[PDB]
Design a protein around this nucleic acid. Sequence first.
RNA 1: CCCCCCCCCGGGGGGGG
RNA 2: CCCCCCCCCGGGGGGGG
Length: 497
Amino acid sequence: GLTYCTHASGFSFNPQTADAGTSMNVVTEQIYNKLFDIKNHSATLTPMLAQSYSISADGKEILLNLRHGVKFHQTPWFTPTRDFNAEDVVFSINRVLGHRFPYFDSIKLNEKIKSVTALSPYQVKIELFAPDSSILSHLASQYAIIFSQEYAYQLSADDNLAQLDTHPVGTGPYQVKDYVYNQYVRLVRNENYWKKEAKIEHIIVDLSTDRSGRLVKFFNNECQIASYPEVSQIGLLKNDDKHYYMQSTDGMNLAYLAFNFDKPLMRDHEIRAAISQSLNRARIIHSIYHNTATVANNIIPEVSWASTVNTPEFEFDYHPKIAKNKLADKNLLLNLWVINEEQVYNPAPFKMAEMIKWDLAQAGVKVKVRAVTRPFLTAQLRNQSENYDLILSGWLAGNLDPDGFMRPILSCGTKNELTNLSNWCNEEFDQFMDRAITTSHLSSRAKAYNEAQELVLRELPIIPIANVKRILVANSRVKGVKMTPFGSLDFSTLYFI
RNA sequence: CCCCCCCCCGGGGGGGG
RNA sequence: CCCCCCCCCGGGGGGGG
Ligand SMILES: [Ca+2]
């Protein structure tokens, strides 16, 4: 057995309905498979539930050839009577097309895909409205998990369709044995997996502790891997210890401040720029993240294939004297909302808020900080009653296609209320993004994404603060631990020496 | 039941990073 | 880590008894 300690914050057996950009979803990446995985900087598609695919010459039709012989989990709540096939893919993709899903609604997946049909039991046809170079990447994201149509059918007969997300059935290398809300998930190896079996038979995912206590549990041998350690407690760790080791990874893990474009005073570009210039972001990174983050003058991370070498100068970096000149006379009062949760991209949200409140005080701007819960925030956004000026947030992604993160955060939409906290709509921005998916040439796409990014850093609908590393500590008895920019920890490769 | 062919997985070996 | 080639095994599919 191995115990893996992580945060309970926004844990779910279903990321399609969870909040976008908050989690690598370590548990559901073990129990469900996708049609493809992307594992590398180059954006190679690894065949998973699809063995292969073709694209039509006009680029509007994709054929998925599904792997034969794949089994869904035999659990106490479900006995499958057929193998995975096209019906499962059609059910799964059709559900999110709507033929509330925050990620898919934020990318507007139903304005990309026209239909999804089974040509045969082992071949699916996707047709698009127009050529779209992003589609296969979205189907390789953590959100695009394939469910069991047979299970969903059985449950619909007796009304219990909610149980799809409470008692999971997947094709992945682990299955759910049992769990206790906010305490633990017990995983057991799938003995009928379609690829190399997981080496460790039993895995407990411990959710029951805050950052402080996770290293306590680790050194008291209550868990053998521990995610997202406290940052002051990394100072207590060494690299050359025989008994444990650390790993850390870059990726798409961004803390940022969004301006509410619904507030008339936030529309003034002079105000946003001066507010950006009031912030001592270097002080913030040093003081909150220590060494686990760098100041972010870019939306697109350097590990992304879309990243343009030459990180320029940010025109609105710390300059407290210019900020004070522009702001002091306006007698500004800003409401700053902070989400009261553990966040992969911000270890001390309130402490960061207070530092922002301080920096803006020096520029003569009064800030009232307001702690808020995810449920409260979610309700207000769904209800369009949100009345913040600033909100402190972030984005986490294992998918480094900018269509999968820049679009949810900043694109026009009516059904992107959970992800676009700026309430920002810019036609010029949206044209860059739409151009970026009309070609399959990486450099061509990158150019379009860099033009979009450059526009964002001029307009300042958000202020980027920090690119945050993901860290874990592992017990030296454990091998096969690979932390990567490109997804969650794969439990199936863990083993004991 | 058997025999071709295709495909996928796993394992072993050899060659090249 | 990976990628070819070979062998063995397992599974699926197609064709022929
Ligand atoms: Ca809104």
